[model samples]
Target: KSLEQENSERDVEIRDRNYFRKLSLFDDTVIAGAEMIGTSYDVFGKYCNVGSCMNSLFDERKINASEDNFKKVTILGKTLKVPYYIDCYSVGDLKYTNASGESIESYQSNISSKSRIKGNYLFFSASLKVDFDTDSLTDFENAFSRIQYTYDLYILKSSAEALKEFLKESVKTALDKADTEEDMNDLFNTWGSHFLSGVVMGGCAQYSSSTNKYTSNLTNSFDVVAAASFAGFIGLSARTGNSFMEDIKKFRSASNIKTHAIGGDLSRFDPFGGATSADQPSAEEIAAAKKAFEDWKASVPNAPELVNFADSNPLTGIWELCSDRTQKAKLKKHFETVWAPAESAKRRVHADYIDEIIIGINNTNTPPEGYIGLKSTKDENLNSKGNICLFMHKAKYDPNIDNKDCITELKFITVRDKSPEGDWVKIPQDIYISPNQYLYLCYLPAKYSAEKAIKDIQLLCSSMILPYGYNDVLDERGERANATEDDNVHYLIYSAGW
Candidate 1:
């Protein structure tokens, strides 16, 4: 009877230990997956929110769409228009110009100049001709809120699935090793070490492999457990030194990284670059720079292309320019002429303009000197909008490296409402949309300025409309509404923001 009771108690202890081990693994997996999914959703959410803001401006009526034969929106008394492409700038470069009219070059350069630039902050700007309305503003705010909620839910779902998988694997391993107390304890210790080390090293190949230089140190850990088992069962061994157990205990307590290294230090094989005195960009700075670059790229129309024949060959000027700082500036200037905007001008009404060369290529389908492709529009169907026209020309300053083509000039027309005689007039009213209204319905701003009267009006439909659905379920179980289907379907519509 005593033996039977002992056996039952042992079984219970084993079951509890295995259960807790599985729980720990499940928790860890949940945390890791949640973190990854959360970050991804945050990135995508910001992208969608920015798109919503742009769309709101498009819906406003006060914005002029006639001057350049393109659609525009206005906000804060400023006309705004969407660019043909997405573009971003580094957080380091948002600033005003000097009296001499020379602007700061790159965000990095601006920081080096001892200017008060905020490393964590980024700015996004788009040019459009629309007046801000309450409804449009509300639309933007609500869209952002929904995006945040959706992102959170996405992360939660992903995390839950990962946790379940991890628990299943861990529980099976524990159950396989549950025969004797000694073996059970050994399995538990091994599982603990594996889980802890995995967390720290992030499962890198070099830290936890048998053939790796660090593996010997990891294997040596099991020796301490064996020694302890011998002491517990037999009290001593002839091979054991006086302080052998103490030394073994010390080895067992060694850090995960230290225990894995073949030698005291593994700097020779360590892939992490040796510690540097220089401070790298912070996470915030990196995030801001990434956002800025994306926004800037969105504004530019073309994909990155080889600037010259030399660029096509790595052995030529491209290689030299990439390696040599003195030649880099000149090469960058040339590339900008062909690939990037030459200069950006701020017009009172147009807000910003690229040089005449870009304007020409956009207005006329002609490619700049060395380039072979015709200019492409952001929306081919909407290219007839007067706003679509722009010119591109050759840059003024180029240190001739070869017979390569470069672009220089750019010109932009003002965004305005069109009159019967084709004259351009600025729109002047705030537009708003009620949350109750469907996203696809036609809406206009409150009023127009005398200078620009509304003429033939039409709202162009596109995939750009926001997708709408209720995120929360109705809590009608205790109410009269829950008793009938019609009551459940019919609910009061509350404004999302406005």
Candidate 2:
């Protein structure tokens, strides 16, 4: 609206473009995408939001930013905050000094000595630290075994299963046409290239043979002749996603395996030519030549769908056979419900936010107050002779039921050792009430009550030291277990707290 205001805005625009140019590594695509951050409006505030473009600059600088350095923008009615800054470095509040000219002890005293800062105190500290008890090799294994199990169960098994399922049909199709050992070898070579590349690209050489064996096992185990009939049966079976007609359609499409061109020159044939003629062939010779060509053409069989094994693209064939997105979604739902119901439920309703984990719990020993005994799948020692136990605080949320009331209870016999005062008296078995909905729980022994169990859990968790790694046990990759994303134990131990 004003002359200098217009000039100032123009200057801001020029500076913003220059910043975008420098930050995006001069890539036009990146610059254009960055500019689209707030395109609904051209207001000064909107352009100020475009300062969110500084994300490119921060990314280029390889720096992390706090929420304070972000600005909000609305694009197509969707609101989001993106990284922004006035000046990348100057306003970042970076601490720097020329050299070690002054000691920090003197500066600390000077700050406290000042009048305005006098009598003012500020302090804050917080952490979920668990002290581990890894004195022996068994204890070390006990601590890290859960990490190994989780890695193998989720990552390794899932991948192997995927490989088996995707490659099953293609491998079977190849094996079916094998008339001799040489044919089998040819089939193996074509499939092996795909297998090796897939394994290498996946960055795991170990899974190659394991995957090959699994693929071979499934291929060998299935009755090849019965498969077509079995597929037809599956279609006829009243399953939700099964379709016999769809399979037939795909099979028919795959079966159309040849292309033909039959026309040839016939004008050069000489009339009344004998078989003895030198230049022109007799009719009998002509008939024999045509018959040979027809016989050769007839001899050629229909190629398998993954035709020319090594030359053909198996990936495309896999996609063609199984790449229905809706079908995949339905299959995933079926797998979760039918194949892995408990695992799926656990994944869907997993206790992600654990308040605390209590180790060194035993059935005889009492737990810390306010804690519940957990049937831990993580640590083996925690469940020794049904004596050692693991416990955690009542889960913050339960998907199964309400939190305010007792969801269930367990019966336990209570006994007391009165020492020399009198013979020990055993109380009748009583039901221990559980307030929270837990996946699994431990049954208490004769001497312990639920309240005592809670108290002991509190004490154990308060003083537990979870050792992250040890020298003796190498990781899955045969290296000393290190704290890294690649190290399974390290990943589990670090993530357990959260």
Candidate 3:
């Protein structure tokens, strides 16, 4: 009987430890707050369902496509826009029903929109990835057309037809001439130097990597190209990024440059020369500048050739080129001829937007610019009708970087309300790592104070104190509470510890 009892005890111990370990580690998200959400994104990507859904400029419109009961929205100057709001953004690998009534996934990656709506939040019910690549013309054109749809629509409704046409025409011409390769490089190097004077003052982030014959990047061709064109379109002087100033909603983006000025704060971009200065140069630097200029000229000696060669090497950027007076004069004269046409070509109605020159050489289209990469879009609309809005993110487990361990992350976005001018008050999405990490956000009504809420949370944590440490707390990555409106809403929220 004793021998049998000993074996039974061992079996119980084995089951208890291993079973609970599995529940904590793999059964739930390895990270504290990430378990609530997963490695998926929504177009009108959302979590938390807001305190209420988007009750923006317009009300809800349904899309069964079968009944043909879709709604038309015309308030924002553009008429007959789709009002059934959700499911606007889609993913490549995640299976989804197609617009043509077919259902699918794990196929090609490109631009797509299987329109549907849920009060504006996107409703793709699977993994959604937007692989936008500038190198791919199809992807590039698609991204721009999408941005153009929003930016142009804002101008049409916010202003009048007469103003829209000229601004529209000129801006397009400017962008068109900005072109590719040879012409593309010079236009942008100067665009950064002249237009974004403050930003380019210290160092030209525009074409930091360039040569006399070609502006280069890791992509190795067409220097400041796409990013520069966009700066001019938006008028780098127009709105401050990552900011809420005087009622301008900024549609922004970050590129390969360590700090693409528009996406980052302006203060750092000023006083010229960036983290280093061209104002002061050593003997070695002067010699290098002279040699680079000599090499540039040696390759192309004639005026037309010189003109062509003008901004070729951007590795030296505008600041470095300007460091050599001889080189600077040649560049200035060449650009003078170019700048006039670019300015005459456009700026007003068409503003800068989420135009980015990202690296798309590889399959995983992730760029490394951070802090200065939050994008915004707003040009003073009076209501949120027929507009798309959403925010969300969470890190995926990349065991490759994690030494064969799980990696985790979290992100949550909610539409709180709108500014009186009609801009949507949006929560910024965040990305994070570490299983110990967590994010907490909640609005306090006029009746409640921080004093009350903190204590309330504490009391709840205390209530579930014993069983809810690390393992048990590996809870829902996105578990919405069952909220009932009343004097005392049942505010119970906790995850147990193993």
Candidate 4:
């Protein structure tokens, strides 16, 4: 590594510490996983692929204040923001007025003449601009109805959502200052929109619920979509990298979530291309997996096994519970033929991936050992007698299967005691199976558990191997960072266009 300047992307040091306490929505996920950008290169560009980072930075320094005194907070160490405003961009680029230029408005006085027509939006309030849809406030209630629900009136931090509500308040402030109807019209026509665009002033105050310690600023900008959406700033007090982090920490300490100690191990799973030390499965491979499923379904006589049990299987049925020889052989063949290769194609096939497991709904049943409880019996009395259990066996790699890993064991001899649900939740319990209900389970080996081994296995099982960042909306988190978007100037040196 050669010498460089800002070690710019180190926010994970802050992120590596925060957590997203387990919610029913994310139980399968490891609790407290970092927001996913790992290296400084991942956040800022060693590759320089996206200019949006500097775009937001430019908007920050362009604040009504001088560029040097930029006030802002870092989100997950990757991106910056003033707030998310629709088309909130640099003002100096466009001159504003009606046809004849009678009420012509320009940001000529606000920015320098050298500034070009195409550039990133500044973070500072004044140099930035917006086109507010005052007629439509739908973006309003969807965001703030929760404000009154949580921190009513007491302003804690600056967020794109919070900024929307404040901009609404700022409108009221502008309207109250208006004297006659025309004054209101003038403000609404020019000043009102201008005022709203620049409303983020670093810290908007709300009365604290407590008297002695009522004031505080938001420290965490972990919520990627909400915080990064903020497009401009109010004041400018230049920050060192460390200070920016401290500021983020301070507010998160006051905000909504509880900080936990479990994120570091999961903070980074070497992005597919870089950190994980593996390549993401290809599009062709994913398509092949799906095709194989379809092909297997066509071969089935009943087609019940062909039905997708990827989701909701824990409810309708965990068909892996096949007690009949024909059913188990069909499943075992399905794996050897379809699922395993798709995985080995994208990511290197492992030596011991899980090849087969059986699930069963038993009233007074003791599952083969080494299995964990999948959920509780839904029956009232809870049938402590009716229980659902899974079977886990490791598949060894074999040359007969083209050097692919194959499940060699059919069942295990050890079991772990635990359950995960109540009735609606995924609680594994010691209750009897109610008539036709069933539960299914899978295994994640712990050998590479700390290394995101399960994440890879999950990807392999997925019928689809999506392009990096396929359906995700973030730039610095998860898939994109792990695969396509990962390699940057930090990891590898390249001249422009290299």
Q: How do the predictions measure up, each by TM-score? A: 0.14, 0.15, 0.15, 0.16
lDDT of 2 at 303: 9
Each model's lDDT comes to: 0.21, 0.24, 0.22, 0.22
Q: Which scores greater on TM-score, model 1 or model 2?
A: 2
Alpha-carbon runs more than 4 Å astray in model 4: 1-199, 204-256, 259-357, 360-374, 377-498
| lDDT for model 4 | 0.22
Off by over 4 Å in 3: 1-279, 302-391, 394-498
RMSD of candidate 2 to true structure, Å: 33.1
Query: Weakest 10 consecutive residues, lDDT, candidate 3?
Result: 301-310
- Candidate 2 Cα outliers beyond 4 Å, as residue runs: 1-142, 145-321, 343-498
User: Backbone clashes in each candidate structure, one number apiece?
Assistant: 63, 20, 37, 53
lDDT of 3 at 446: 25
Which digits, one per residue and each the tens of the lDDT, describe model 2 over residues 434-490? Answer: 222111222222322211221112111211343322012222233332211221222
Give one digit per residue, the lDDT tens place, for model 1 in 57-98. Answer: 011121122233222433223343321111111121111111
Q: Write the per-residue lDDT of candidate 3 for residues 100-142, one digit (tens) a residue.
A: 1100111111112322111221222221222122222111111
